[PDB]
Amino acid sequence: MNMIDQLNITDFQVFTDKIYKFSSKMILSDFHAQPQGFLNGGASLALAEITAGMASNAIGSGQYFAFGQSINANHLNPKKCEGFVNARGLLLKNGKRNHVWEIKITDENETLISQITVVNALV
C-alpha cells in the first residue's frame, strides 16, 4: 500500500459554492505521528498537495492532469495525533496554465492547525 492510501483521506468532495471549493477528512493513526506524539507536519503537507491535485483534476474532467508546482505551509497550532483533521480548500485562481489553492487544515474544534497554499501546474 502506498502513502496516499495510508494517509486515509475520507469524504473528499469538490463543489462550487464560479468559486470552486473542496473539503475532506483525514483519519489519524500512528502512521501520522511524529516522535513527540503530535501530528507530523509532513502528513499535513501531503494531504494538501494530494487533495489539491484531486480537486484540480475533477474540475478538468479529462482535459488535464494536475502536477504540484509549488507549495507553502505555516504550521500554526500543534495537533495531538488522534481523531481527525479537516482539509478545506478554496480555488484562488482558475487559470489556463495553473490552479492556486488556499487550503486550511483544522481539527475537530475548527482550530486552524495549518494554512497551506498549493500551486498546481496544468499539463
Which residues carry out catalysis?
Answer: 49
Q: Which of 69, 84, 86, 88 binds its own copies (CB under 8 A)?
A: 69
Closest CA to 106 of 114, 117, 95: 114
The residues, ordered by sequence, that sit 6+ positions from 20 with a Cβ below 8 Å of its Cβ are 14, 55, 59, 90, 91, 94
Q: Does residue 70 interact with its own copies by CB under 8 A?
A: yes
Q: Does residue 37 interact with its own copies by CB under 8 A?
A: no
Q: Does residue 58 interact with its own copies by CB under 8 A?
A: no
Phi-psi region of 71 (alpha: psi -120 to 50; beta: other; left: phi over 0): beta
Do 90 and 102 meet the contact criterion of CB atoms below 8 Å apart? yes
Q: Does residue 68 interact with its own copies by CB under 8 A?
A: yes
Q: Which of 11, 13, 15, 34 binds its own copies (CB under 8 A)?
A: 34
Q: How crowded is the C-beta side of 99, counted as CA atoms within 13 Å? A: 29
Q: Does residue 55 interact with its own copies by CB under 8 A?
A: no
* Site residues (vs its own copies, CB under 8 A): 1-4, 6-7, 30-36, 38, 40-43, 45-50, 53, 65, 67-78, 92-93, 95, 97, 100, 102, 112, 115, 117, 119
